[model samples]
Target: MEIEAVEASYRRWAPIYDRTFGAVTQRGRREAVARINAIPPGRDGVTRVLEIGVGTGLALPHYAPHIRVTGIDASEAMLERARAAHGRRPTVESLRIMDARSLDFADESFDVVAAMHVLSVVPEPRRVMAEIARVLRPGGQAVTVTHFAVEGRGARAALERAMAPLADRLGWHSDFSRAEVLSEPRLRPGEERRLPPLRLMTLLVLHRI
Candidate 1:
């Protein structure tokens, strides 16, 4: 999807996102946050977290207070809603409008990077994965929750490919594959689990090498 298409799509979705997609993705969000919360603090005694494509900040309140969170998104409309939701929270460090492909943070700045339901929506997902690897501290983890392309020929697979042409209008590729995220060599794949709602989503964990 083009940047303009992503921005426009989010602008249209931001208002109702919390009640729509946000609600549907609740289970994924909870699972991601749970894993993050389970992680021990780094040597610095704090767990610094970055959440890309934070959308409406629906997951903000679930983060443990000790985990400092910085969220970024490409869409201003979506960030606006996120800000309204948790911008003032003590656990939230900051929320900025940023492109995932070109993260503004310094290298090894975060202990964990969470990209929930966002990989397929962002353009240049591989580039975004590279940026995620860059900003993640060595030994840090990156977690993602998304719908990846199903294997082989099947009814769902056919439907996903049929929706490929609508990516621009949908602001996400239904046929997005896991390889797009796994291609970053600096990140080693860890635990992976299929999620609920007909198992359309997947939660994958990767450790920075």
Candidate 2:
């Protein structure tokens, strides 16, 4: 998906996102945050978290008080909603407009990097994954909730195939593969599980090695 398409799609979805896709993705978001909350604070006595593609900030309130969140998104319109949602909260450090392919943070900047339902939406997921690995501190966690491509000759696979051509317009790839997320060498895979709502989404945890 092109950057322009991502911006355009979020502009349309930002208005009703909280009630629509945001609600649908609640389970995955909660699970991701819960995993983050469970992690112990780093040596600096702070658990710095970087939330990528934090659309509408729906997951912001779910984070624990100790978790300081720094969110970034490619869509300013969507981030406006996120700011409106949790801009005043102390746990939220900052919200910035940024491209995942080119993160602005210094190396080892965050103890945790959460990419909720976003890998498939970006143009270069592998590059984004590499950036995730770079900015994450060694032994830090990278938690992600995404809809990976369906396999086999099931109906879901057929549906994904049908929607493949609509990726740009939809702002997300229906047939996005999990391999894209796992391609980065510095990140070691940890736990992996399918989320609720018929297991359409997946929660993957990786440790920066």
RMSD of each: 0.9, 0.9
Candidate 1, lDDT over the whole model: 0.91
> What is the clash count of model 2?
0
Q: How high is the CA lDDT of each candidate model?
A: 0.91, 0.91
* Tens-digit lDDT track of model 1 for 1-209: 77889999999888888887788889989999999988999756789999999988988999997899999998999999889878999989999988898998999999999999899998888899999999999999998899999979989999999999998777799999989989899999999999876899999999999
Worst 10 residues of 2 by lDDT: 38-47
Q: Which stretches of candidate 2 lie over 4 Å from their true place?
A: none
Per-residue lDDT of candidate 2, residues 1-209 (tens digit): 78889999999888888887888879888888999999999766679999999989988999898889999998999999889879999999999999999999999989999998899999888899999999999899999999998788989999999999997777799999989899999999889999876788989998999
